[PDB]
Amino acid sequence: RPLWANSLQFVFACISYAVGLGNVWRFPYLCQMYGGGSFLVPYIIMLIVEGMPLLYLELAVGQRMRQGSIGAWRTISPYLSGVGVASVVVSFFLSMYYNVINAWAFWYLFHSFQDPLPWSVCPLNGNHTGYDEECEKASSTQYFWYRKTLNISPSLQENGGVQWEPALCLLLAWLVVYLCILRGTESTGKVVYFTASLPYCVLIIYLIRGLTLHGATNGLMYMFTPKIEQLANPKAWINAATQIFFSLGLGFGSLIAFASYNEPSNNCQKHAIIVSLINSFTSIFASIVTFSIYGFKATFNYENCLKKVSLLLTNTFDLEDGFLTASNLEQVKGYLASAYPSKYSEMFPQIKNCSLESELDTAVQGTGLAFIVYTEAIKNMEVSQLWSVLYFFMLLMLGIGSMLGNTAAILTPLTDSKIISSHLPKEAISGLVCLVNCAIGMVFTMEAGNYWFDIFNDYAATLSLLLIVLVETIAVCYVYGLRRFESDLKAMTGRAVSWYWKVMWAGVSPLLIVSLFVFYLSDYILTGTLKYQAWDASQGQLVTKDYPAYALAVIGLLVASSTMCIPLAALGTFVQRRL
Amino acid sequence: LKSALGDKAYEWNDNEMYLFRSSVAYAMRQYFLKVKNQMILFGEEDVRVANLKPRISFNFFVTAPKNVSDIIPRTEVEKAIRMSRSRINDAFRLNDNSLEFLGIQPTLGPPNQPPVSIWLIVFGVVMGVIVVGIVILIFTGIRDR
Amino acid sequence: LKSALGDKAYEWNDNEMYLFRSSVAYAMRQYFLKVKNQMILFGEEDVRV
Ligand SMILES: *[C@@H]1O[C@H](CO)[C@@H](O[C@@H]2O[C@H](CO)[C@@H](O)[C@H](O)[C@H]2NC(C)=O)[C@H](O)[C@H]1NC(C)=O
Ligand SMILES: *[C@@H]1O[C@H](CO)[C@@H](O[C@@H]2O[C@H](CO)[C@@H](O)[C@H](O)[C@H]2NC(C)=O)[C@H](O)[C@H]1NC(C)=O
Ligand SMILES: *[C@@H]1O[C@H](CO)[C@@H](O)[C@H](O)[C@H]1NC(C)=O
Ligand code: PRO
Ligand SMILES: [Cl-]
């Protein structure tokens, strides 16, 4: 098969396939969901037991068996043929929803040429005297992201018809990926290389514009302080582990294909670490930028809870203007109780109990933490147009890189069967894949689209990857491993594997993965039903509602039709081999 | 004051109440010239003020030039001030959010400036470049079969 | 006017002379309060034109 070049690429392709939107978009949203410093510790713990050794295992297997993501396993024990099919199905389900993020980034970048920015002012109401109702309870940006780009219906039951704009943007994103995948992975080096270098000259610009905002240290002192209370929440730990397995790509059967091409003179033990660390490190970097800007937003909100109330007080019982800042606030709030109890009894239920600890925690909850925050720092700049263009170009580039990786992982085991690459040229295989995925991705752009995106973001990927990384290791180390495997030798010559890698991927990966699995199911089963977060415009705050029935069915099927292929293939061999 | 001007804010002594009364009389003079085509010589003593306070929130009403029992109805004072509010404001440097009249609110200016739908424009152009690419590439492709 | 405002320039009827006289009286009121510490009630009829 074709090969690599310069060598310095292979590691740039791995770095560009791992630094994707699992770090600058999904890690902040997760870290915000579970408390900040209650999501880091698990992260590191994992990364030093279950993220690095399995990456080294995957690269070694992909280098020694010399074949793709399905041919690699058949050559071990033909009763283990399914794992490749599960690893292809998962990558299919992943790309199908992963491209809509690039779609939304295109939509925002397109709208960021107007003036003034459309998410910076709210429309005028039915009598040209004040802003609209949703834009006063909710900020401007939340109104934009929930009612101009999505038109999100307030219930997973009240569905609708295909929207018009974000569908067209999804079409453009698929055309761009299909246009870039016109060269075969075996040689897409240029594009790979370019991504990374790009997406690093921006994050530092936002780190210099973040850490000087007024009220940008409260966000940090929140993102780092730990709470030994949520170190019980099992969803936090299973989400840490799945976060990892999703960020590196362990289980998508892609990394394998990569450490598959590459010439067999590498030193793999030093291309695992140099990848793994960098990945994790970049995530930390992003979580220092966002959870600073976010912090600023929070302080802003709190500042107003002090203006209005104070002004409110200033308006009622009267008081010389400019006399109720912050300290004076409490002062007069106290001196107005013991002086005018006639109206203090009827105003007291109103005084908005608003204090910094809340507005720092429930401000921009949801899947849009990278969209309704980085705007709260773009509508406060010098020349906002150019810098919003910069940030959204960064997101778009990361997404395109990650999608390149995924589509390569799904085309490698399709352009190898001498049957299929016999009556379909190498230009219409990619075409067929992109057309099918764009025609199926039109379910996330309806009026109830964001909920289906939340489902496909929460079950599929994570669960599948988990359930798989276990069969892989138990296949390499107790069916044909350690022995013949440690007999790597002539492959590289690193004389051995260090006895801190034998233990870690023959007797610690399976124990920990099985333990975490049961530890998570012990909560899903007794919880009852599952609950999602709806919009409820009439107030501008997300509420919680329990899932309907068929949504539960689809959650079940997205894990069944992805982790139930291995035993079906085992049965297919046990029963095929009859006569 | 201290909200709008922030600093540089002057102090509100009776010489300011004099200017306010005189300016309101001017506004009333203007209204009865370009609506009712009369000539009524309002003065600064025809603007009665009541309940001055720290917040500086008072009440006022206007009477005919020399007829103490003749109060100009409120729905006409609410129109003269609507006419000349932009000129009463700058006399004090206030800005329509620090000179509330509690019953007269501003309302003039809607948003509709885009003639061309810039989003559409940009999207359109971009799709062009990429289609060109994903066409020409296909041809160099059949070129090397 | 037409030089400074260019357009939007209002017209100069006697209601403007009234405002001018009243504002000058206000200025004089202010001067005899922060220089000479007196209280002199100037009016708009004390500014002859
Ligand atoms: C804001 O806080 C005040 C005081 O903490 C709350 O006032 C109390 O309201 C409860 C009703 O839920 C009464 O039983 C108490 O007697 C009230 N306390 C006092 C001192 O009057 C107020 O309800 C809070 N606001 C909101 C919206 O919950
Ligand atoms: C002062 O204004 C009052 C109006 O408030 C005038 O009173 C009117 O007088 C006429 C005839 O004298 C009556 O027909 C009206 O009914 C009166 N008005 C009201 C409301 O009752 C009064 O004449 C004015 N003073 C002068 C000197 O003209
Ligand atoms: C507000 O606008 C409507 C037209 O939509 C108009 O008919 C109505 O009189 C206006 N009301 C006020 C109080 O200005
Ligand atoms: O790298 C991948 O395959 C995707 C995108 C980043 C994390 N998971
Ligand atoms: Cl990560």
Author numbering:
A (entry chain B): 5 to 583
B (entry chain A): 624 to 768
C (entry chain C): 624 to 672
Task: Provide the authors' own sentences about this structure as they appear in the paper.
B0AT1 (SLC6A19) and SIT1 (SLC6A20) are special members of the SLC6 family that rely on the ancillary protein Angiotensin-converting enzyme 2 (ACE2) or Collectrin for their membrane trafficking. ACE2 functions as a peptidase that regulates the maturation of angiotensin (Ang) and serves as the critical host receptor for SARS-CoV-2, while Collectrin is a homolog of ACE2 with a similar tissue distribution, including the liver and kidneys. B0AT1 is responsible for the uptake of neutral amino acids such as glutamine (Gln), leucine (Leu), and methionine (Met).
Our structural analysis revealed that SIT1 adopts an occluded conformation, consisting of 12 transmembrane (TM) segments arranged in a LeuT-fold. An interesting characteristic of SIT1 is the extension of the C-terminal end of TM7 into the extracellular space, where it interacts with the Collectrin-like domain (CLD) of ACE2, similar to the ACE2-B0AT1 complex. In contrast, the Pro-binding pocket is smaller than that of Met and Gln, with its α-carboxylate group binding to the carbonyl oxygen atoms of Tyr21, and the side chains of Ser251, Ser406, and Asn410, while its α-amino group binds to the carbonyl oxygen atoms of Phe250. Additionally, in our structural analysis, we have identified a putative ion located on the extracellular side of SIT1, coordinated by the side chains of Asn27, Tyr47, Gln247, Ser251, Asn283, and Ser287. RBD and the occluded conformation of ACE2-SIT1+Pro provide important clues for substrate release. In the occluded conformation, Trp8 of ILpre_TM1, Phe14 of TM1a, Phe262 and Tyr265 in TM6b enclose a π-π interaction network.
